[PDB]
Each structure stands twice: as structure tokens, then as C-alpha cells.
Amino acid sequence: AEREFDMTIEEVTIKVAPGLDYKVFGFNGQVPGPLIHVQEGDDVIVNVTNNTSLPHTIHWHGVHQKGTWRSDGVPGVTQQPIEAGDSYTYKFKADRIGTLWYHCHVNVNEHVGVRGMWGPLIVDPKQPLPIEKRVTKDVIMMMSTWESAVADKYGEGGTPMNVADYFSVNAKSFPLTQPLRVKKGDVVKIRFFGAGGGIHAMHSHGHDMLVTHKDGLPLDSPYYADTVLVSPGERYDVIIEADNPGRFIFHDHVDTHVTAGGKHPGGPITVIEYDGVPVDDWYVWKDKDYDPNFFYSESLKQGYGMFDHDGFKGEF
Amino acid sequence: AEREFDMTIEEVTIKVAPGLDYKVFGFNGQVPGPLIHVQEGDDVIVNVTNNTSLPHTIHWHGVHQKGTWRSDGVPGVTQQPIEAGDSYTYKFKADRIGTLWYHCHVNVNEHVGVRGMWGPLIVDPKQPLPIEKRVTKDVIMMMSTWESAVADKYGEGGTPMNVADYFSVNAKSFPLTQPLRVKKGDVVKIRFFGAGGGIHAMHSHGHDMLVTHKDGLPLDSPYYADTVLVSPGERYDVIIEADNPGRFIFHDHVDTHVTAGGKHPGGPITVIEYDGVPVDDWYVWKDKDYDPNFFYSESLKQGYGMFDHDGFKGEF
Amino acid sequence: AEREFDMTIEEVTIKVAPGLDYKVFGFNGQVPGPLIHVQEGDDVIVNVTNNTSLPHTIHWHGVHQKGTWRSDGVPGVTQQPIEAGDSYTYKFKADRIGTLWYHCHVNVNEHVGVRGMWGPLIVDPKQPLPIEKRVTKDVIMMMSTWESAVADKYGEGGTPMNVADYFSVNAKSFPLTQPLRVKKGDVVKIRFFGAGGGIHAMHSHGHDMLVTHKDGLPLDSPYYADTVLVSPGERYDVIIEADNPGRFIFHDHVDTHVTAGGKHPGGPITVIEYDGVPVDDWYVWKDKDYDPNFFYSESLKQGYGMFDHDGFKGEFE
Ligand SMILES: [Cl-]
Ligand SMILES: [Cu+2]
Ligand SMILES: [Cu+2]
Ligand SMILES: [Cu+2]
Ligand SMILES: [Cu+2]
Ligand SMILES: [Cu+2]
Ligand SMILES: [Cu+2]
Ligand SMILES: [Cu+2]
Ligand SMILES: [Cu+2]
Ligand SMILES: [Cu+2]
Ligand SMILES: [Cu+2]
Ligand SMILES: [Cu+2]
Ligand SMILES: [Cu+2]
Ligand SMILES: [O-]
Ligand SMILES: [O-]
Ligand SMILES: [O-]
Ligand SMILES: [O]
Ligand SMILES: [O]
Ligand SMILES: [O]
């Protein structure tokens, strides 16, 4: 089918960590950008309006651009950039299946590295794996890093001379991340994204992960892991059988990554929280103000389209 | 069978490199911590006493904690910390096979990152692979990194603002490591662990490695490699057929890691030494005071339980 | 067959990026070093003369040195170093197939990390994969990093204390790299090497890569990827079917790696340029002064032997 979406680029401020508000260029004013969910073979049309002060593009990572290379989104190579105030339309056929993503391709070290210019693009195979058939919950985790020294000033950041001192999943640092709430018997698909410039060793306590897809394509030889290394650009899809009730932390195992501005704990940390496990008095997330769509799992149930999430919106 | 043992946590000092003594929090006062070797299905009981001035826990990485999540060792999630001077008992069933490990889960960026709070946990499968049946020598290699500036300073370190300037295997930097001594026809299992916060590209001269396990689970499709990338939290098991006598260095190929405080050589370097190869007067290790258990290879031969090793003990 | 080569080690200066000239120890005065291309089972003889002021060796990474360990090239382990002005001869049988490489094994954090002491060693299998037979273009991409503070000073660099602020493929930083020119129907083998001390996430726009070999040995279970992580010492071989005409950038996806001295763009970036696509006036590489051998693809067609390339040569003092 033909699916047409309108996107903006906005200058907004987001709260990444306690102690760290960050100036970003949010797609539709949010970080992660809106979930785009379509079916294998669809014709996609995205009209982009640049409501910021600087030029951008959108590149569709993993999208072949079969017969549409002029929509690849690379300045100086497939198009001239989208300037401030201007608009531009992308058209492509979603013939590549799986977990894809989209991001700015202007000044990528800064725009993608620390200005949040990215979001998920999920293409459903017309014919999914048997394994995907059993899935009861779909989960998106986009990891990135932040440089506090340049949080308020567009135009700097993302070089080897900068210090990345805050780490996140879906643009929040623990304890501002949210738990992954499951019930016994759930079949959980988790899609990891190396959205920023760091490497993330994602480790699930209490469970092994079945690695089923690399960069959205199904592996002929899936393998189990308790720790999955995710590096810039990559995606890994895993399956977790939620058959082991408890509270099980789920986090980046890169030691410096579980800090925030030098202080521990912080970073890409969540907790697999099983329904019905009694909450202890000392539980860090006792009485959490809970967001069931922090990993886009509600949005992912709503069919094809473009989904904003107010939990990800920034302030003007 | 039920395996019960007693572990303490001690403030001790170890020598990591010539010129670098390091204050660590050693399990049973040693780094690497004691080897725990059990069989698949064993019931494990660990009585832990914190004889240090700071709180810790012990998390059993790879252990599912099926119906025992309260033994997962995560402060604020599965337990309150073990305070200075107190004791805590962990109980779990070793139903997950393979190369596992354990480490503190309090202040992990420092404690695991630079204070040595880790050790190996090997669970023997009921049904080993055929190649595992042929193994004549079993080898543990736990890689980590060190920040010389905080060598004397508990409560500091393991942040992006620190500099990791020393590198090791089993808490020694070359030349203070030990050779891997083999004889022609040996079948060598090597287990690599990403114990600290760094990434290590483990490369065997003179030989290809067959990669057989990821995080302790057997791959359906094992593959050969001469260089295996090991990142924090991960384990890789390989097999080397010792069929090429010579002296063949075996080391981290990450260029900066074969240094020690800016000097070369150092870091995670050993040498596969074959019996009967004549020794040149210029061979760097011709007069080595040899420790046959530097890779726990002897301990691994002595039954099921917990094993200390005097060569890893620190000074009070 | 017996194949004998004479190699030198020279002090030269290479241009890594606009405004970054770098002092290196180039094999045959070039970085990447010369392509060595032999057949499985050949007996290789390499006579090395050190024309620089410092000691070196050559280690043959991936070469088993079966019964020839004393040619492994490691100082203090298998030999004494090759001192300034001296020579040394390596002999080994190429019985290990695939994408191998060679590099100095003295002071490696500096010599391999920033002095360009490395080059590719390709061993053709007697029995290549079926897919390898469809290949119409073979491509070598050797990634490394550079520390500008020590560009002019042999004897320093390659430590945790240093800052790697420039990045390259085959020792050039975009825009001084060259495009990968194909035509529709091409079958492209690319061989990625982690020559330096950095990690590189190589991403092909417009195409998936079929990953077929790890460290030169064929995988029983090849897999597709659009992003392949390459870390020091490793090689990956992939296949790209060139069936999607466009201009498709191909680059290290590690964000800080697409910079040069703190500026963007730069780093390990090329463009897959399909012959049939009309060139726009704003295209960054319109009228590029083109080197068709930037990825050794012409040398790789020219038979067994050792091949220099002037596009990689630096300047003598
Ligand atoms: Cl064409
Ligand atoms: Cu942008
Ligand atoms: Cu991308
Ligand atoms: Cu892309
Ligand atoms: Cu953990
Ligand atoms: Cu601790
Ligand atoms: Cu762990
Ligand atoms: Cu764990
Ligand atoms: Cu080596
Ligand atoms: Cu050298
Ligand atoms: Cu090497
Ligand atoms: Cu080697
Ligand atoms: Cu790109
Ligand atoms: O952990
Ligand atoms: O090496
Ligand atoms: O990208
Ligand atoms: O990309
Ligand atoms: O863990
Ligand atoms: O090597």
C-alpha cells in the first residue's frame, strides 16, 4: 500500500538525566523520533519540514532505495541538504524487511551522536519467522551517548576531543528510564539499536536471549547469548522467554556506561519486572511513575503508520 | 549435588605490573576471585562475609536464578547491599551450563572495573560436545583494565573521565603474566572473559581457534577465527589444536592495550610454549618462574567446589 | 610454486588528510604496504631490508608458520629485531587460505597503530567458494586511525594518553579517499581489515553485505549485514551484488570516526558509484582525480606476485 507521513524537525530540549537537560533536533519534537511501522512492499512517502535553524536530511538506514537512490538522504551525494525552513519529500518502496532506522546524515557526528536525530523504522515481513509468530510483546531499545559540555549549544560535539559522560536507552539515563513490565509466559522480542556513537554490551539478568536477526535480517543460525554487543549502526533482534518471574535488571555491561556525569548508578539500565512479584520496601522503582510505551511496545501494536509518543517529546 | 562454601571480601593489594600495585576488593583476598567449578544441576550455597569498609553484593552472571531471583545479587533490585562487616548467603541451582562468572553489583564501574571483584564460575554440562571430550587442558583468561591514577584510592575510578592505562589477563600485565605451556597433540580449551570495562581482540599466533561457545552456550555453527573480540560481560570458548610446535605469542591485538603506563610492551600477552622447543638466550621468558595454575588449569582438574590460588592472593 | 619477494622498510611522509601529513615506516615506501598475492601451498620467501633508523620485524598474521615458527616475526620470541640497515629473510608455506595480512611486530602500539607498518596478504584457496567464483571485483579496505600530535615524531604515539583524531581507509581520510566504481551486474568482494587500533562499523548504503569469511576462513553459516564491525586484527570478507544503481555512500558508522581534526566530514568514507548514473553538478566527487586501484582492485587481477602502488606512496626526506 501507499503510506504517506508528514514529519517536522524541531529545536527542543529534553531531559536525559537528573542533572542533564539537552538541546536536540527532534523529529516531530521528540527523541526517539516517531515510530514508523510499515509492511514489506509498501510505498512510503515522507514529507519533511525543517523547523530548525540548521540544514538536515533524513537517511533511511537499511532501506535499499531500489530505483530511488535520490531519496537516500546523503547531502552532497544524493541530494542537497534540506535548509532551514524548507521542506523535502522522500519516496521509497519498503522492500527490505525487519528492524531498520532513520537518522540525519548532515553533520552526523553531532546531529546523530548527541542531537537525537534518529528513530525506528519497522518493516513487517509479509512472511515472518515462526519464532516471530509466538511473540506477545515487541520492544525497541535505542542506545546513545551524550556530551554534557555541549548540551545547550548546537554546533559542537561528537568529536574524539569531547567527553561522552552520559549514556541512555531511548534518550533517558537510569533512574529516568522505565521498567520492562512482563507477565509469566510472555514471548518478548527486543530490538537493539546502536543509534549513537558508542558500543553497548546489553546483558539480561535472569534470562538468555535468542539472537534471531542481524540488522533486521533473520539468521540462518540463531544463537543464544546473555550479553549482546551493539555498535554504531547495528541492530540485533532477540527473543526472551518470560518464564522466570522476579525483578531482573537489564543493562549495558560496559562499566563506564553505568554512570552519569561521573556518578553511579546511571545509564542504559532497565528492569524486567514480572507482574505479581511483591514489591519490596527498598525497591528502587517502588511507586514508579510508569510509562507502558517507553519502549514503543504499545505503539507497536497499533498497525501501520507513524506514531508519536508524548513521553519522548521535548520542550520548546 | 549440594555444594556449599564460604567466601569473604577483603581489602588487599595486588601487583598488576612492574611498578603498579593496586588496592582491590578481593574475593578471598585474591584477584581473580576463587574458581567455582560445579556440575549442571548442582545446588549451590555461598556464604559471603564482607570484611571491607564498603558495601558489596555478588551477582552470578549467566545464572538464571530460576525461582531464586532474590539471589541475583543486585542492590536495590533483588537485595539490600551486604554492609561492611555483615554476611549474606546466596542459594541457587546451577541449571545453566558453561563458562559463567560472578562479580560485585554495587558501584560496578569501580568495583568490577578496577577493584578486581570478579571470578570464574564453570558449570560442566551433562552432555559436553564431543570436542570438549578431547580436551587435555582447560584455560581461563579473564581480561580487565586498570587506571593507575586511582590505584591507591578506593571509592574513585571507572568513569569516562579516568584513563585506563594498564591492561591484563588474570590481573597481570606482561611480563608478569605466565606462559601457556602445552605439548604437541594437546587439545586446549580456552575460555575468554570480558571481566573489566574494556574490549579485547584476542589473537593466537601460529594457530586458528575454533569458536565453540558464546556466553557458555554451544554454537550450532561454530567458526574458526585467529582473532576473537571479547567485550564487557561476554565469554567466548575456543579450541586450539596444539599441533604446531614453536613459541607463539597470544595477545590482545588492540594496539593501545599492549602498553603499561605508556611503555611497550605490556598488557594481555602470553606465549604458547611447546615442550621440547629449544630455548634461545634472547627469549624474553627463558628464565620464567613458572606458575602452572596461572590460568586455573590445574584447579580445573581437581573436582567440584571452590578453589583459591596463592598466586592470585593480595597483601593485607 | 616458490615465490620470492624483496621488500624494504623506508621512512616516508604520507598525506592522510587535507593538512595532515604523517611520518610513517612504509613497506616499500608506501602505506598500505604492497599487496602480496599467492596461491594456497606456495612457498613464500620474503627478503626484508630495513632502510629506517629503528628496528622492525614483519609478522605474518594468519600464517600458521607450520614448522617455521622462527619466521613468525616476533622480537624476543621468535627472533631478534631487524636493526637499522640490516636485512632478514622470512620463509613460510602459504598453507592457510584467505584474507591475511602482515605488519611490524616491534613497538606495535606505535608502528602498527600510527606508522602504517602493515599490508595485505591474499592467499587464493585451491577450492574457492562457489560465490567467490562469481566475483567480478575484489576490494581491499584496511582501516586505521591517526594521532595528529605525533605526526612528525617517530618514537611517540599509540598510547591511551594520545588522542586519535583522524581516521582512514587505506591511509586516506575523506575526501582524499577514492570512490568504489561499479556497474550493474558486478559482484563485489570486499575484504575489511582492522589494521589499526580502532573499531570500525562499516556500513554500505543501498545494499546488504553477505558476510562470507571471518579472518579469511569461510563461514559455514554466512549471514547478511548492512553494518559490519571490524576490530583490531580481524578481517571480514563480504559479497555485495551490485544490482541497485545509484551513488551510495559506504562508511564507518562510528560517529566520531567521520571527522578529521575535529571537523566533518572526513574519515573512512567512500561512495559506491554506479557507472550508469548521471553526475549532478553538486555531487561532492564530480571530476574526482580518480585512482582505480585505491582498493587494490586492479592489482588483484594481475596475477600472483607482489604489487606496489604509487597511489599509496609517500615522500622521502
Ligand atoms: Cl551501472
Ligand atoms: Cu541534522
Ligand atoms: Cu546509519
Ligand atoms: Cu545507511
Ligand atoms: Cu548485571
Ligand atoms: Cu563491591
Ligand atoms: Cu555481569
Ligand atoms: Cu548478569
Ligand atoms: Cu601478534
Ligand atoms: Cu616497526
Ligand atoms: Cu596481527
Ligand atoms: Cu598474528
Ligand atoms: Cu550512512
Ligand atoms: O553485570
Ligand atoms: O599482532
Ligand atoms: O549512517
Ligand atoms: O547510514
Ligand atoms: O551481570
Ligand atoms: O599478530
Side-chain angles (χ1 to χ4, degrees), chain A residues 298-314:
Chain A
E298 286 319 301
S299 295
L300 281 157
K301 295 159 191 303
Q302 292 161 16
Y304 305 124
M306 167 179 293
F307 304 91
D308 285 4
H309 173 52
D310 295 307
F312 295 152
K313 297 272 176 179

Side-chain angles (χ1 to χ4, degrees), chain A residues 205 208 226-227 244 247 284, chain B residues 61 64 72 77 214-215 235:
Chain A
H205 292 217
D208 292 312
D226 63 51
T227 305
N244 180 19
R247 292 192 301 263
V284 63
Chain B
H61 179 138
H64 292 160
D72 199 44
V77 178
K214 161 62 177 146
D215 305 340
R235 290 86 62 221

Side-chain angles (χ1 to χ4, degrees), chain C residues 141-162:
Chain C
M141 299 193 186
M142 304 186 85
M143 272 61 70
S144 64
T145 72
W146 314 84
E147 302 158 10
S148 73
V150 295
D152 200 349
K153 60 230 238 222
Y154 293 135
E156 276 184 51
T159 74
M161 280 61 76
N162 294 104

Side-chain angles (χ1 to χ4, degrees), chain A residues 164 201 203 205-206 208 221 224-227 229 243-248 251 253 255 258-259 262 264 277 282-284, chain B residues 59 61 64 66-67 69 72 76-80 96 103 105 107-109 113 160 196-197 214-215 217 221 231-232 235:
Chain A
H203 170 55
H205 292 217
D208 292 312
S221 186
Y224 286 99
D226 63 51
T227 305
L229 189 62
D243 60 7
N244 180 19
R247 292 192 301 263
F248 282 111
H251 63 94
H253 210 296
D255 298 40
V258 287
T259 64
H264 173 90
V277 180
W282 42 256
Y283 180 40
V284 63
Chain B
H59 157 65
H61 179 138
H64 292 160
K66 212 60 143 228
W69 66 274
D72 199 44
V77 178
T78 65
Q79 75 177 94
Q80 296 183 104
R96 161 69 144 73
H103 50 83
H105 222 290
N107 291 339
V108 292
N109 53 304
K214 161 62 177 146
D215 305 340
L217 293 177
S221 185
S231 93
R235 290 86 62 221

